[PDB]
């Protein structure tokens, strides 16, 4: 149940993660409980926040930096600090606008990419319609 | 692929009918509600009290009627705790079903969150949760701007078909037939002689 | 079957008529055309002079403003001497210089039958003055403009710009309620279909 | 910014720095400038040849 | 090529001329060396014509299903930009070469100019072939874009 | 049997040979030549190298009644190895204008000898189609999820050709047409450009009237067809996208290249203008001298 959450891109939040799994797995040692394995429990917050950034990069291309606080369960300073570090890793890309009007997750796309995608679309349509026409014919015999 | 041989009794036919509805109501990726309505098993099995309300639940999903769905569920979720212990999926199912149908019938593939608030009958925070859930199942692909408050859809997952739906798909081709025809007639007219 | 002398004279005649019909656009091509058929010679000099005077004036009536170069590199500087001073007069936006230049040189201008064209440039000093002002300042108070062009009121200069952008030379729009004139120039016309 | 080592522009109308990281100067459009460049040389040389006819 | 045996004795009597009587034919000899030895000493070769029907023509000429899928189908537009870049540069080099040539091209004897100031392949001609291919290529490509964009939506 | 397929490649010989065999059984009017189909398979691409006639009788009263001479098929195959030992049954051709429902029952018989589901290649003898005059099906048996029983049905695959280079030049040698449906110069591809758009019209018409036929004349609501139709719309552009704005910027780019190329051509011909004048100029002197 723990891992199924993380292998999928899912909306989730930290005091949901914390509240469920604190009476479960802080009673078992290694990564959790202890006094030194609480610096390994401390690490899980970072990762829950980070799983969300990965979701939010994919779905949103623009979200408000204030709406994003609400999602991550953070103050504004921390929301930034995490975005910056995850981009350093290169796991996501972003650009933050600092008065918190926008954070836009992507690198801006090259002009050539956009056009190559449009050629790809058209070719699939023509392939569809051809095949559809031959399946129309067979169905006249059936009918 | 079921046999013409008869060795399935009415009990089994009804037992399966019930289970198939249970799977769809408590599912998260079953929009084959109409498929049950277009197979004899469940379409013609309404002939017990259990299959009065159940058939209406499958019908509620197709039309996007929330009020009817809630009234039937309100009674039954208690009686049967299989609905009770799986409720979250069950109420969110009709919101996801209405979400995919709205986008379908339009020729512009974007909805305001404000339009979704009205149509799925959720507050504005929970409209954003609905979008997130749908993309996570893989129903839809596209992008979100929260700063214009839009979700702009680029791809829709295929779904059941019905007479209504055919006319909706047909009209769009009528325009494109027309556009292709007159575009080609004008290009024909220019460089008449340059078809060597 | 024409001679290249016939063709030269012809395009030159259209430009004069055109200027009087406030065709300054077609007039400009036509006079540059006339000179290119026309030979360079000291034998053709009196023809070329009149063509070059006609050309300079056409540009100032556009608001295009002839090159300073045109006057110096030609071997005609004395003949075109009034046109050289007209080009400078309009450039600065100076009513005071301009009134002095056309009176001072009145008779010479009157011989060439271009005295009639020159008086029309009195409007054009005002229009050209405003095109400089919208480039130099994005937002500029009504009063400041009055200082530069020796004008009398804020309300008066508002009429002048109102009329000049009906011709659409200045490419601005007037804020009456705020006291300034704000240009709408930002290009990015390589995103428009204009290059096509 | 004067080097264009990271492009971007310094906005002191409000006190921000815009960070661009995007290509500047398209290769194809550039070489078209040289193509016109060569032809402007070439038509002068045709006109050198055409001095025989005059 | 086709052969047909003729009697050895007939060749002695000069009956190879006999085989071309009552038409001028399309007589030509496509191959000699061993052929003309064997003709001389054995055979009379035949020329080859082809028969085909109007049905069979249509079968032969048809070779694509993409006949109607080639002016709606297009190539990636990065590939087109690469192509325009390549083309313009190539003609830029050929123009410098042409310019060196056309500093003269005014002395007596064409042939002397071609050697001296390279008109070896004629950079005029060379630029014409290159210009014309990419110019024609771009008109189709723009036309494909504009058809699809307006018609489909 | 291979239940994996993707495409059918066809040699040119196959088509022509079935038309020859068709006229020499003297078949017409629901008597349709049926021969065996020979080639490579156990391959997603069905590669058909050859075809031959079988002794076959088609009754026109009933097409569910047919004659096939089974014994002949084994003997013929031994002689196929003599030619090349890599030709086996991979189906059977039909010569008719279109698919019959007696063709499903016929297909049964060739299963016995094939390591691949048997191919139906319709070789038309009126040479219809705006691409190749061949349609291609392979019989597949599947469950249908529409609430209907398990069918064996002929499902369409694309048609393509693979031609030996040796053979292909024979096609060029035979063919005296300079080709107006294949690439060439500007004008030739200008026809090819219009031809494709007119092909789309015809294909676009047939779908509209199929959809009308379903809800008034009650042809099966076939979900698999209509699903591909839903994806046509999702892959279809929407005005006001920055991708379709980039198309405007990309138009400018190639047109400008044409604009400079057009100027370049104009320059070059003006060199020849002056040349010819220098040729006339000399030839005045020569004439005057004579």
Curated annotation (Swiss-Prot), chain A:
The lineage of its organism: Eukaryota, Fungi, Dikarya, Ascomycota, Saccharomycotina. It comes from the Eukaryota. N-acetylated by NAT1. This is 26S proteasome regulatory subunit RPN5. Present with 5710 molecules/cell in log phase SD medium. Acts as a regulatory subunit of the 26S proteasome which is involved in the ATP-dependent degradation of ubiquitinated proteins. Disulfide bonds: none annotated. Residues 1-110 form the PCI domain. Belongs to the proteasome subunit p55 family. The chain holds residues 298 to 440 of 445 of the full protein.
Swiss-Prot record, chain B:
Residues 1-158 form the PCI domain. Coiled coil: none annotated. Present with 12400 molecules/cell in log phase SD medium. Belongs to the proteasome subunit S11 family. Acts as a regulatory subunit of the 26S proteasome which is involved in the ATP-dependent degradation of ubiquitinated proteins. This is 26S proteasome regulatory subunit RPN9. It comes from Saccharomyces cerevisiae (strain ATCC 204508 / S288c) (Baker's yeast). The gene is RPN9.
Curated annotation (Swiss-Prot), chain D:
The lineage of its organism: Eukaryota, Fungi, Dikarya, Ascomycota, Saccharomycotina. It comes from Saccharomyces cerevisiae (strain ATCC 204508 / S288c). The chain holds residues 381 to 434 of 434 of the full protein. N-acetylated by NAT1. Present with 16800 molecules/cell in log phase SD medium. Component of the lid subcomplex of the 19S proteasome regulatory particle complex (also named PA700 complex). The 26S proteasome consists of a 20S proteasome core and two 19S regulatory subunits. Component of the lid subcomplex of the 26S proteasome, a multiprotein complex involved in the ATP-dependent degradation of ubiquitinated proteins. In the complex, RPN6 is required for proteasome assembly. Belongs to the proteasome subunit S9 family. This is 26S proteasome regulatory subunit RPN6. It comes from the Eukaryota. Disulfide bonds: none annotated.
Swiss-Prot record, chain F:
It comes from the Eukaryota. It holds the Pfam family JAB. CDD domains: MPN_RPN7_8. InterPro entries: EIF3F/CSN6-like_C, JAMM/MPN+_dom, MPN, MPN_RPN7_8. One of its GO terms (biological process) is proteasome-mediated ubiquitin-dependent protein catabolic process. One of its GO terms (molecular function) is metallopeptidase activity. The keyword Acetylation applies. N-acetylated by NAT1. PROSITE patterns: MPN. One of its GO terms (cellular component) is proteasome complex. Keywords: Acetylation, Phosphoprotein, Proteasome. Present with 19800 molecules/cell in log phase SD medium. Acts as a regulatory subunit of the 26S proteasome which is involved in the ATP-dependent degradation of ubiquitinated proteins. Belongs to the peptidase M67A family. This is 26S proteasome regulatory subunit RPN8. It comes from Saccharomyces cerevisiae (strain ATCC 204508 / S288c).
